[PDB]
Design a protein around this ligand. Sequence first.
Ligand SMILES: [K+]
Ligand SMILES: [K+]
Ligand SMILES: [K+]
Ligand SMILES: [K+]
Ligand SMILES: [K+]
Ligand SMILES: [K+]
Ligand SMILES: [K+]
Ligand SMILES: [K+]
Ligand SMILES: [K+]
Ligand SMILES: [K+]
Ligand SMILES: [K+]
Ligand SMILES: [K+]
Ligand SMILES: [K+]
Ligand SMILES: [K+]
Ligand SMILES: [K+]
Ligand SMILES: [K+]
Ligand SMILES: [K+]
Ligand SMILES: [K+]
Ligand SMILES: [K+]
Ligand SMILES: [K+]
Ligand SMILES: [K+]
Ligand SMILES: [K+]
Ligand SMILES: [K+]
Ligand SMILES: [K+]
Ligand SMILES: [K+]
Ligand SMILES: [K+]
Ligand SMILES: [K+]
Ligand SMILES: [K+]
Ligand SMILES: [K+]
Ligand SMILES: [Mg+2]
Ligand SMILES: [Mg+2]
Ligand SMILES: [Mg+2]
Ligand SMILES: [Mg+2]
Ligand SMILES: [Mg+2]
Ligand SMILES: [Mg+2]
Ligand SMILES: [Mg+2]
Ligand SMILES: [Mg+2]
Ligand SMILES: [Mg+2]
Ligand SMILES: [Mg+2]
Ligand SMILES: [Mg+2]
Ligand SMILES: [Mg+2]
Ligand SMILES: [Mg+2]
Ligand SMILES: [Mg+2]
Ligand SMILES: [Mg+2]
Ligand SMILES: [Mg+2]
Ligand SMILES: [Mg+2]
Ligand SMILES: [Mg+2]
Ligand SMILES: [Mg+2]
Ligand SMILES: [Mg+2]
Ligand SMILES: [Mg+2]
Ligand SMILES: [Mg+2]
Ligand SMILES: [Mg+2]
Ligand SMILES: [Mg+2]
Ligand SMILES: [Mg+2]
Ligand SMILES: [Mg+2]
Ligand SMILES: [Mg+2]
Ligand SMILES: [Mg+2]
Ligand SMILES: [Mg+2]
Ligand SMILES: [Mg+2]
Ligand SMILES: [Mg+2]
Ligand SMILES: [Mg+2]
Ligand SMILES: [Mg+2]
Ligand SMILES: [Mg+2]
Ligand SMILES: [Mg+2]
Ligand SMILES: [Mg+2]
Ligand SMILES: [Mg+2]
Ligand SMILES: [Mg+2]
Ligand SMILES: [Mg+2]
Ligand SMILES: [Mg+2]
Ligand SMILES: [Mg+2]
Ligand SMILES: [Mg+2]
Ligand SMILES: [Mg+2]
Ligand SMILES: [Mg+2]
Ligand SMILES: [Mg+2]
Ligand SMILES: [Mg+2]
Ligand SMILES: [Mg+2]
Ligand SMILES: [Mg+2]
Ligand SMILES: [Mg+2]
Ligand SMILES: [Mg+2]
Ligand SMILES: [Mg+2]
Ligand SMILES: [Mg+2]
Ligand SMILES: [Mg+2]
Ligand SMILES: [Mg+2]
Ligand SMILES: [Mg+2]
Ligand SMILES: [Mg+2]
Ligand SMILES: [Mg+2]
Ligand SMILES: [Mg+2]
Ligand SMILES: [Mg+2]
Ligand SMILES: [Mg+2]
Ligand SMILES: [Mg+2]
Ligand SMILES: [Mg+2]
Ligand SMILES: [Mg+2]
Ligand SMILES: [Mg+2]
Ligand SMILES: [Mg+2]
Ligand SMILES: [Mg+2]
Ligand SMILES: [Mg+2]
Ligand SMILES: [Mg+2]
Ligand SMILES: [Mg+2]
Ligand SMILES: [Mg+2]
Ligand SMILES: [Mg+2]
Lengths: 271, 46
Amino acid sequence: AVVKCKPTSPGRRHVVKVVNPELHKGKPFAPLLEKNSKSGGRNNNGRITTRHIGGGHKQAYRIVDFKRNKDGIPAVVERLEYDPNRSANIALVLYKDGERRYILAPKGLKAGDQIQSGVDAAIKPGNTLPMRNIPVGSTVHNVEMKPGKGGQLARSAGTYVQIVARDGAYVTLRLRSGEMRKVEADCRATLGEVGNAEHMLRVLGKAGAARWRGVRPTVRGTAMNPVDHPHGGGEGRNFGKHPVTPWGVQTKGKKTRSNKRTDKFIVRRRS
Amino acid sequence: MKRTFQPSVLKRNRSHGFRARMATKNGRQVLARRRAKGRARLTVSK
RNA sequence: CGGGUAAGUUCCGACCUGCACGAAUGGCGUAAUGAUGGCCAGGCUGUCUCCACCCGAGACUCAGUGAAAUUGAACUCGCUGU
RNA sequence: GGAAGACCAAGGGUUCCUGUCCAACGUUAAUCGGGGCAGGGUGAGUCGACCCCUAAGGCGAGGCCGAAAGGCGUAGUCGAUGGGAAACAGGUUAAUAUUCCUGUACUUGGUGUUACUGCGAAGGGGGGACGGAGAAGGCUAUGUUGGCCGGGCGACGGUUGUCCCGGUUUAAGCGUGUAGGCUGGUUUUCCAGGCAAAUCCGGAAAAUCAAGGCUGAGGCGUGAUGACGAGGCACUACGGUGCUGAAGCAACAAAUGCCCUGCUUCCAGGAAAAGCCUCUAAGCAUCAGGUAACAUCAAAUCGUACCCCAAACCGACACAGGUGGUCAGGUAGAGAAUACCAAGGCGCUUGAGAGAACUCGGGUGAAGGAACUAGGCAAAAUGGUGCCGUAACUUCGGGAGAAGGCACGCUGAUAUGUAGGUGAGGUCCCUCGCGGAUGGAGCUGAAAUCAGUCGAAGAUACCAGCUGGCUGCAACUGUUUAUUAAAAACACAGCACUGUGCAAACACGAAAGUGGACGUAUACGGUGUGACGCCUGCCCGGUGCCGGAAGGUUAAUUGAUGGGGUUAG
RNA sequence: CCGAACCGACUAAUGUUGAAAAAUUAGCGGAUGACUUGUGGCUGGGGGUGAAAGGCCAAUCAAACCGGGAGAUAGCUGGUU
RNA sequence: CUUGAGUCUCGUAGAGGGGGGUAGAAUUCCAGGUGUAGCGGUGAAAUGCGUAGAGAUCUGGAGGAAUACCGGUGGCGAAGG
Ligand SMILES: [K+]
Ligand SMILES: [K+]
Ligand SMILES: [K+]
Ligand SMILES: [K+]
Ligand SMILES: [K+]
Ligand SMILES: [K+]
Ligand SMILES: [K+]
Ligand SMILES: [K+]
Ligand SMILES: [K+]
Ligand SMILES: [K+]
Ligand SMILES: [K+]
Ligand SMILES: [K+]
Ligand SMILES: [K+]
Ligand SMILES: [K+]
Ligand SMILES: [K+]
Ligand SMILES: [K+]
Ligand SMILES: [K+]
Ligand SMILES: [K+]
Ligand SMILES: [K+]
Ligand SMILES: [K+]
Ligand SMILES: [K+]
Ligand SMILES: [K+]
Ligand SMILES: [K+]
Ligand SMILES: [K+]
Ligand SMILES: [K+]
Ligand SMILES: [K+]
Ligand SMILES: [K+]
Ligand SMILES: [K+]
Ligand SMILES: [K+]
Ligand SMILES: [Mg+2]
Ligand SMILES: [Mg+2]
Ligand SMILES: [Mg+2]
Ligand SMILES: [Mg+2]
Ligand SMILES: [Mg+2]
Ligand SMILES: [Mg+2]
Ligand SMILES: [Mg+2]
Ligand SMILES: [Mg+2]
Ligand SMILES: [Mg+2]
Ligand SMILES: [Mg+2]
Ligand SMILES: [Mg+2]
Ligand SMILES: [Mg+2]
Ligand SMILES: [Mg+2]
Ligand SMILES: [Mg+2]
Ligand SMILES: [Mg+2]
Ligand SMILES: [Mg+2]
Ligand SMILES: [Mg+2]
Ligand SMILES: [Mg+2]
Ligand SMILES: [Mg+2]
Ligand SMILES: [Mg+2]
Ligand SMILES: [Mg+2]
Ligand SMILES: [Mg+2]
Ligand SMILES: [Mg+2]
Ligand SMILES: [Mg+2]
Ligand SMILES: [Mg+2]
Ligand SMILES: [Mg+2]
Ligand SMILES: [Mg+2]
Ligand SMILES: [Mg+2]
Ligand SMILES: [Mg+2]
Ligand SMILES: [Mg+2]
Ligand SMILES: [Mg+2]
Ligand SMILES: [Mg+2]
Ligand SMILES: [Mg+2]
Ligand SMILES: [Mg+2]
Ligand SMILES: [Mg+2]
Ligand SMILES: [Mg+2]
Ligand SMILES: [Mg+2]
Ligand SMILES: [Mg+2]
Ligand SMILES: [Mg+2]
Ligand SMILES: [Mg+2]
Ligand SMILES: [Mg+2]
Ligand SMILES: [Mg+2]
Ligand SMILES: [Mg+2]
Ligand SMILES: [Mg+2]
Ligand SMILES: [Mg+2]
Ligand SMILES: [Mg+2]
Ligand SMILES: [Mg+2]
Ligand SMILES: [Mg+2]
Ligand SMILES: [Mg+2]
Ligand SMILES: [Mg+2]
Ligand SMILES: [Mg+2]
Ligand SMILES: [Mg+2]
Ligand SMILES: [Mg+2]
Ligand SMILES: [Mg+2]
Ligand SMILES: [Mg+2]
Ligand SMILES: [Mg+2]
Ligand SMILES: [Mg+2]
Ligand SMILES: [Mg+2]
Ligand SMILES: [Mg+2]
Ligand SMILES: [Mg+2]
Ligand SMILES: [Mg+2]
Ligand SMILES: [Mg+2]
Ligand SMILES: [Mg+2]
Ligand SMILES: [Mg+2]
Ligand SMILES: [Mg+2]
Ligand SMILES: [Mg+2]
Ligand SMILES: [Mg+2]
Ligand SMILES: [Mg+2]
Ligand SMILES: [Mg+2]
Ligand SMILES: [Mg+2]
Ligand SMILES: [Mg+2]
């Protein structure tokens, strides 16, 4: 549910929380945990290569099954859990043979539900099939781009993909961006939408709430000196130039896609 | 007031010690230079 | 122009003749917050009228130790002129 | 005296102790010294390092990449600031001591017996193993008072008592298993999981019992017929040694320490690997190996002095500076504030006089009270607890400690000490205990009311908000020009535009790669704006961006055609 | 929210051949957080890092330090027995 | 007391309400085929669209909204509907 905080202090007045009473309150499933230490946005030259990253809360990595290739064996949802690594929630599922795995939690999935993968799985939310076996027009998520590679599209909270057509070895998908994209029909997809759609309704409310998430402050280029940024300089607030990135490329409409290798799969760009 | 030299022997040896000098060709040229000058103490290594 | 003062180039409220405001290089408001800018009042006082006395640490004298910047050379006054 | 005491890490390196010397060093003198010279001093199976194990990160056989130098990285191998066995009390030196001595312990390993016996890993599983905040209960450290024991009878009125002073200490280990915390137990059968196997873990189905296990502070017992112990006595080379030794209990208060890696709750969702336990594979078969008891041997090496909020470290100085961790007594107090003290440590390495101006740091001030000044700068002032009471405005939380006001010491009574807390003997019960119930002796003890009483003054010292009215700017908490700027600047939650379909855009990089992200459009980057409320109008001619692609123009490339040089003729 | 430790640095006086090449004293702000701190690691000079002041990168910063090209060049100033 | 008011039994008509699904027509857009100089609009025009191939015509796709005929001074609802 979406809950406004009461304004008992200035840093709380605008906070809006997403509170889900169904998420597990205890610890995660340890055999599927890994450590995952932070980067500060720095690569192996030790240089900052993505600005505005650092700090935030310590986080363990949950191994999530994006391939969904344990075919023919049913699993039951044991519990939903918070995952710090992503916007979606995850579900711990127990297979009939006694194996446990984490999956992205689809909308509507709850403890006790049954799921299955494979060519013969039923058309139900949480089931995974090759898109060859999914009716045209369906809503799916966690879509593979190459067969067997694992889900890569529509994984964020509340996202989904529409199967709009099927021609030969390929299906045409409408992505969340609005792009129409061809993908091999042997690629798998999970029925339904990714859950936790209220994610986008939260309001951080204060500066520190962004710092808790590992985001460091953004300094506007127009607030700098010319040596630092093309926008810098001026006696007072001055601008007088076409907006650019810190490295000089136009940043208000100039397109940057240049991938002739994958152009053949884009039926229609998002705009 | 806190001054610039705050000694630590581990940091001294890791930063400037004999084995650190031997690890790169530029560090071995430091040692070659100091041997040619005839320094009595080649490095910080105690 | 009005208010506040005995008296107000500041302040507050207006007027519009905007040298040269104006709508996300945002416009107009806004409770709360501020070692933030301006203005007024009560209390308070050596801030002041106008300073007095006192207690300590130096300054001063004696003994011991013992610097510094500077320095062409000096037998190194005023005035009016040059 | 929450240090200017005690003790570590770091850093230093003989500064430590003793004798001797006073040139230089010491801001003076120096017989003294962290100074000179000489001698002495650091004792470990248990403390630390080394060691086993890993984090960030480093290096890295082959490998991939790069003119060369080199870059990245796999298998690996390093790397603590983290995980991993075990010792305490007393005594002793001029100087070391959990290291020496006395007493009493514990751990790991090698051997060898004996008894019994499926052992076996580079593999599987378990465990190790983990956040923030908050709330209590049970405790101990520790303190206070009484009792006890020893001593005292007071330089000046009184002091044989409801008087004064001191002491009243004891460990690890071993045994016991309590307040509390967690979890149902046991036995069969079966199985697409745990790269193979598995009796282990996971899963399924039955039967049966309902209490079984795990964890755990403290207490109690033992350790201890010991040790220590106020003092006494005897010697001193008057520094100190030698000898002996009483009581050695209870109640109450009580941590920020322990139970507690608990419990409750929240979202921002909280290392790793080994030691350890367990399972089997290859293999081994009356062998090896395993388990237990007993014996015996081993536990090396390096550090250990001394300073450590400092005269020994970082600051050129015996420099108002800087420096992480641990300990935490009394009275008042909410307190680790503050005042006065304890243990303990110090008076800061020039002194002696004098009592001018002027400077510095403070005290008080007649009448006036901001007239001072750029400006109330500075100063003065306010200041506690309980109760009464409190406006506009407001995002309904605030504003608010608004403002303003009253009470406050001591003595007696209520009540020879109350409400409350604590809780003995006794008594009863028991599935007999570290038990339940009853009962309340003793101990501790607010707050209030009534009456009285002293002073100019009872929050008496230290300590400890000045308040209100109008307005600009920024929503707010934050950040910044180390060393003249803390702000209205930066950031910020929120908003919008825009890029990005994943081998993402983008960034570091001749490259390999790496970050973005073990993320996937409810995501990620860039840009502007800057909570919230009401809103955000017109202009696409210019510059940019986006789309279009018929025509004009146009590169390398191609080399038609024309012209020339040469000369067989 | 009030307030010590701890982290800061708004005002004033002193100091300015300082006790100190940035402090002392009286007041001042934060004080469960975008907090603070120990140990170790990583980023390198047209480069880093920057809640952005051209701030900081060893008392050095509109391009660190050290060595080299190097006796750069100096239509300028000084000096020239 | 049973005549007002209500309960039960059986049936009837209804665009009464809430939720979900689906169908066909049409508009627009996208792609392609044929085809060529106009289309569109008005009182008349112009802006606009079109030789970069529109309009027209055929095929395929995407998507949203509304439900022709039935349909009625017909029905249902407290009103809004
Ligand atoms: K999450
Ligand atoms: K910003
Ligand atoms: K600018
Ligand atoms: K810079
Ligand atoms: K500017
Ligand atoms: K400027
Ligand atoms: K270093
Ligand atoms: K702008
Ligand atoms: K606004
Ligand atoms: K301020
Ligand atoms: K103001
Ligand atoms: K001196
Ligand atoms: K007496
Ligand atoms: K020692
Ligand atoms: K005191
Ligand atoms: K005198
Ligand atoms: K009582
Ligand atoms: K106060
Ligand atoms: K505003
Ligand atoms: K400030
Ligand atoms: K700033
Ligand atoms: K508002
Ligand atoms: K608001
Ligand atoms: K324009
Ligand atoms: K334009
Ligand atoms: K930390
Ligand atoms: K330097
Ligand atoms: K440079
Ligand atoms: K009906
Ligand atoms: Mg960013
Ligand atoms: Mg994340
Ligand atoms: Mg932003
Ligand atoms: Mg600037
Ligand atoms: Mg530029
Ligand atoms: Mg301007
Ligand atoms: Mg302009
Ligand atoms: Mg006027
Ligand atoms: Mg006036
Ligand atoms: Mg005005
Ligand atoms: Mg403007
Ligand atoms: Mg303008
Ligand atoms: Mg506009
Ligand atoms: Mg504009
Ligand atoms: Mg604008
Ligand atoms: Mg603004
Ligand atoms: Mg010496
Ligand atoms: Mg000595
Ligand atoms: Mg001596
Ligand atoms: Mg002397
Ligand atoms: Mg002499
Ligand atoms: Mg000496
Ligand atoms: Mg000596
Ligand atoms: Mg390498
Ligand atoms: Mg090699
Ligand atoms: Mg490694
Ligand atoms: Mg190792
Ligand atoms: Mg360590
Ligand atoms: Mg000693
Ligand atoms: Mg005790
Ligand atoms: Mg007497
Ligand atoms: Mg005992
Ligand atoms: Mg014991
Ligand atoms: Mg505490
Ligand atoms: Mg010692
Ligand atoms: Mg001294
Ligand atoms: Mg000092
Ligand atoms: Mg400190
Ligand atoms: Mg105390
Ligand atoms: Mg104190
Ligand atoms: Mg005098
Ligand atoms: Mg005087
Ligand atoms: Mg004075
Ligand atoms: Mg005074
Ligand atoms: Mg006066
Ligand atoms: Mg008087
Ligand atoms: Mg007076
Ligand atoms: Mg007055
Ligand atoms: Mg005046
Ligand atoms: Mg005047
Ligand atoms: Mg003042
Ligand atoms: Mg004062
Ligand atoms: Mg108060
Ligand atoms: Mg008690
Ligand atoms: Mg103004
Ligand atoms: Mg602000
Ligand atoms: Mg602030
Ligand atoms: Mg400054
Ligand atoms: Mg300042
Ligand atoms: Mg990649
Ligand atoms: Mg702005
Ligand atoms: Mg600062
Ligand atoms: Mg201060
Ligand atoms: Mg505050
Ligand atoms: Mg505070
Ligand atoms: Mg260089
Ligand atoms: Mg500037
Ligand atoms: Mg510097
Ligand atoms: Mg340059
Ligand atoms: Mg040259
Ligand atoms: Mg020269």
